[PDB]
């Protein structure tokens, strides 16, 4: 079945650096667009990174822009987010979704449809 | 010729070889249907760093 685990939470003070991971297991890791999106405590959702199919990132949200890099991998099949700057405003669940469309299957290339969902982590800071 | 000699006797001789000769060239194969995804590479949206 479909799993995907992420991990790397824990209270870091600002100003360091994380990495989570997200590892998918069930199904070709190459034929599907990842997504990296937040969830900030109590609030709605906010997207925060992406990579389509040939490990090209699609752009990062508009105030993140700057320290967070994304990074792929389809021989372990992981997707990793480098985290740099990391401020008070950065305390959130972070979930790693994955596309619906498989790539050439019907113009462009399919990047819509998060369907599947891990249970995020808790990266918080704070000092 | 085949004599090597130019007095030839009463008689039937076998010379040479008669052989039709081909017309054209011929190549089969069964419709081609795998082809290598390189499109997907080379028309990609978005390349790696
Ligand atoms: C292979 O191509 C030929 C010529 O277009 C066609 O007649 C044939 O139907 C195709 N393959 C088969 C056996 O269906």
């Known amino acids: 079945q479909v799993q995907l685990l992420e991990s790397g939470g824990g209270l870091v003070q600002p100003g360091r650096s994380l990495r989570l991971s997200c590892a998918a297991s069930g199904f070709t890791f190459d034929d599907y667009a990842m997504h990296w999106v937040r969830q900030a405590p109590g609030k709605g959702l906010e997207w925060v990174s992406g990579?389509?199919?040939?490990?090209?990132?699609?752009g990062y949200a508009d105030s993140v822009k700057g320290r967070f890099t994304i990074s792929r991998d389809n021989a372990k099949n992981s997707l990793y987010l480098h985290m740099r700057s990391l401020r008070a405003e950065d305390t959130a669940l972070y979930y790693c979704?994955?596309?619906?469309?498989?790539?050439?299957?019907?113009?462009?290339?399919?990047?819509?449809?998060?369907?599947?969902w891990g249970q995020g982590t808790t990266v918080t800071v704070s000092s | 010729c085949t004599l090597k000699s130019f007095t030839v006797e009463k008689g039937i001789y076998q010379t040479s070889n008669f052989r039709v000769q081909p017309t054209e060239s011929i190549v089969r194969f069964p419709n081609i249907t795998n082809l290598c995804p390189f499109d997907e590479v080379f028309n990609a949206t978005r390349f790696a760093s």
């Open positions: 979704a994955k596309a619906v469309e498989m790539v050439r299957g019907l113009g462009a290339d399919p990047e819509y449809g998060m369907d599947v």
């Open positions: 990579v389509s199919w040939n490990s090209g990132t699609i």
